[PDB]
Design a protein around this nucleic acid. Sequence first.
RNA 1: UGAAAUGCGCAGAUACCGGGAGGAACGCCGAUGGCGAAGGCAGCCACCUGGUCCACCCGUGACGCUGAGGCGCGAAAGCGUGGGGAGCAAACCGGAUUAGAUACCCGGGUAGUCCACGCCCUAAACGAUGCGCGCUAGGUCUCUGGGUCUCCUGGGGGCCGAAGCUA
RNA 2: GGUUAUUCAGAUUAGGUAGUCGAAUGACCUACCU
RNA 3: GGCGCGGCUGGGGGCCUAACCCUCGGAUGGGGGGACAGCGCUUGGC
Lengths: 101, 271, 70, 88, 119
Amino acid sequence: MRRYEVNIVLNPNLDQSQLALEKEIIQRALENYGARVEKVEELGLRRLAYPIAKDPQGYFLWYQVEMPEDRVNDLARELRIRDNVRRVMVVKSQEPFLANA
Amino acid sequence: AVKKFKPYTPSRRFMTVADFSEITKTEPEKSLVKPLKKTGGRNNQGRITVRFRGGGHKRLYRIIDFKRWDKVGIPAKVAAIEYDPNRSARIALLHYVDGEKRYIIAPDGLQVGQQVVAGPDAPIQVGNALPLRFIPVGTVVHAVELEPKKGAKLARAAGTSAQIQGREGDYVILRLPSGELRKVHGECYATVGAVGNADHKNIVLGKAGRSRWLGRRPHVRGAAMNPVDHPHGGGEGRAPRGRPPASPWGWQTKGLKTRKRRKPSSRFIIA
Amino acid sequence: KAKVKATLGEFDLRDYRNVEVLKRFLSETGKILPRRRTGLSAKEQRILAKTIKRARILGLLPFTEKLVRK
Amino acid sequence: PITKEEKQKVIQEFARFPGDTGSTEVQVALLTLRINRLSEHLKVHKKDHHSHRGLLMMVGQRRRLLRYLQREDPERYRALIEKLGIRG
Amino acid sequence: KRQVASGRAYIHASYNNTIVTITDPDGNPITWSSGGVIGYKGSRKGTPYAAQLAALDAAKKAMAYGMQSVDVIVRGTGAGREQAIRALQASGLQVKSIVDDTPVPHNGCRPKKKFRKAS
RNA sequence: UGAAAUGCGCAGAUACCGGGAGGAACGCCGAUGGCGAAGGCAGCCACCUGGUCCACCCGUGACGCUGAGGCGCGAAAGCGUGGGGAGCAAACCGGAUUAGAUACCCGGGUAGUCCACGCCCUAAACGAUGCGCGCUAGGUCUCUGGGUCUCCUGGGGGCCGAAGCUA
RNA sequence: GGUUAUUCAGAUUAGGUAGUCGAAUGACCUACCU
RNA sequence: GGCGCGGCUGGGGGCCUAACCCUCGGAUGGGGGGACAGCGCUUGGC
Ligand SMILES: [Mg+2]
Ligand SMILES: [Mg+2]
Ligand SMILES: [Mg+2]
Ligand SMILES: [Mg+2]
Ligand SMILES: [Mg+2]
Ligand SMILES: [Mg+2]
Ligand SMILES: [Mg+2]
Ligand SMILES: [Mg+2]
Ligand SMILES: [Mg+2]
Ligand SMILES: [Mg+2]
Ligand SMILES: [Mg+2]
Ligand SMILES: [Mg+2]
Ligand SMILES: [Mg+2]
Ligand SMILES: [Mg+2]
Ligand SMILES: [Mg+2]
Ligand SMILES: [Mg+2]
Ligand SMILES: [Mg+2]
Ligand SMILES: [Mg+2]
Ligand SMILES: [Mg+2]
Ligand SMILES: [Mg+2]
Ligand SMILES: [Mg+2]
Ligand SMILES: [Mg+2]
Ligand SMILES: [Mg+2]
Ligand SMILES: [Mg+2]
Ligand SMILES: [Mg+2]
Ligand SMILES: [Mg+2]
Ligand SMILES: [Mg+2]
Ligand SMILES: [Mg+2]
């Protein structure tokens, strides 16, 4: 049931109303594959280093989550279907590695 | 992938034939509003209009659903993959929840079992069909329409398909099985993914007769005829085309384009 | 001239989001700075770059920026 | 991987007495799992040669044991070969 | 066509000839020049001297289009690179800066037999 | 480019900004670095999976080492069917150099390079060093693991050197 | 003045080849080798 | 010789729809194409 770290990046120039929609799709999606979400850190808009889809900003979200280690690959296929989704980016989770303690 | 044959007879040494593994143990076509008489050979004056057709096994026409927006949102279960004798593709007898049954060009991946459904809502999963303004660019899709509400034209041949290159106004870009580049209408429906039985091209008729079963008759070289008959008619000991190689009607076949410049279908292409 | 080690407090170099932290390793060009310039260990330098790469994919860190005034 | 859980179960189901995590009898069963597991994987990953080597080693290792176990005690071999179900 | 105080100057530093194009803020050429444009040929066009005369002849015309400021950008590990720039000083035009956009593949297309040197 | 010429360019090229397609390779990290039996392996993400090292000294009790034949893997090139095709590029064409130049340099260019499946089975396939095991100074830096830890202990990767070997 | 073809007379070589190079006449406007 | 205006415009770009064409569980309508195409007269070509 390994822990993951589903980053997602959404169409920054997208209103909170439509954003509501996209945020729910992600929700049910994560659920359609049973990703009983742990944490979250929805860090809003942010300026990024390179225009992603020609936009300098982009919405970020970060659902830490445990789930079946197989449907994980497929889940990300789903999250990427949305075009207002501008870069899903799952990750296996690992205890931090302190540097210069 | 294809059935080979031990050479216990010439011709049979080279002749391969499909493996109808994908055919869901179902000889009989759905006799229901599904088969239909079929016949022909040449045109409606008595005259031959297309050389060299004729003969070859008797056929039943299987009626196919190419509009597939009659049943919007109405689901259906894929009851069977059947053999169609009159297309390269295989077909899927699918039962609708309605209790309505039709046939569809079985695309690659389709499993007998699969739910499937048409309409704008529908999931972008293999099998389902829906308008174009609605499939995520990049998707390979098949059995497309061309003008809307008009039935499928593009990509119905076996294992063929087209991708969406982009959208642009009421229209979407497509790359036809031919490589062509076209703006089709947004409201055009298209079943998702690519066509069943892509294994097709690799059969090898192998003998002469097999072409005959296909109803294709022998076709005779121009060279072989006489001047009365055909522009390559000098016959005079195996001989060189005497001129730029032509059709029986004498139009150049060596490379000459034929497409009517002033066609309106024109300003919607690029390939 | 200035190791990036004694340049910052304690942190998680396996984190791929502390944009502020990480930028402190990527020159005035975009280059993932050498070892000879962050002094980190072998083991360290790695998990570092591994994330710094991760970063750029999300869009937080760059890939290159123009070389400025000569 | 293999479930550290059912691994224990394998060890459990095959062993002369509690603890005992290394009897010939075990190792066999114990490998056999990892074998059949790999086996089944290669069956889809045909192109994965590298790993295949491992399987060849794995089949080897157990080949030895099963021999030593047959060589030393025929009685309990005829059991393990069959309980486990191999030698075909 | 229009005159503007703010602009941009691009330096193309080849080995066999360096050339510069001066464009408006957006990036749309108002004028340009190069070692041939100057009066040279083949190798001589590679000379940093021409690279001088170029940037000048460029800037020179540029000036008469109301150009005054010119954020500079160079591309080309060419030999006459900085002299092209040097010339934008002595040109008489306020260089807002100096950038090296000189493009670099993150290891993509195999290059000619010549530029095969890596190993 | 040694300098050139063929080449491209007023039918508007080169330089520059924007938009799009497509293929291939993975800059900085990178290394005297790591991994693998070898060939060999480098963006990032997950998934599936092989080997290997250390700790605890818990289990089995000599179950080992090798290995003709066999079986598998086996760079590049090359072959078959089918895709794909940006850059590069034998063959080929042109320019130039030359006495000549079927070459070196330049302009152009096709298989090929890429993928799927199948075959080929070679190499300076090199450490030119078969594998396993025990013996016989140390010095130095380096990767990786364990331990109250200016250092002991185990596993790799190097350079210098006891004895000894060595043409 | 230029181009080309040839030739021997020299020239460069230790020498030879070839070439470059020079001259004449007719037509015309550094490379290899012993 | 230049600005503003309307009829006339000629050319070129764009958009429209209602002619005209295709099509849609028969529609005084919906959809697609569209002043193009098709067809009439006429021009020169192959
Ligand atoms: Mg014939
Ligand atoms: Mg005739
Ligand atoms: Mg003839
Ligand atoms: Mg005859
Ligand atoms: Mg004859
Ligand atoms: Mg366990
Ligand atoms: Mg010239
Ligand atoms: Mg004991
Ligand atoms: Mg004991
Ligand atoms: Mg004994
Ligand atoms: Mg190859
Ligand atoms: Mg060949
Ligand atoms: Mg060939
Ligand atoms: Mg070597
Ligand atoms: Mg030594
Ligand atoms: Mg000695
Ligand atoms: Mg000695
Ligand atoms: Mg000896
Ligand atoms: Mg002499
Ligand atoms: Mg002589
Ligand atoms: Mg004479
Ligand atoms: Mg007009
Ligand atoms: Mg108009
Ligand atoms: Mg329109
Ligand atoms: Mg209309
Ligand atoms: Mg319309
Ligand atoms: Mg009416
Ligand atoms: Mg329209």
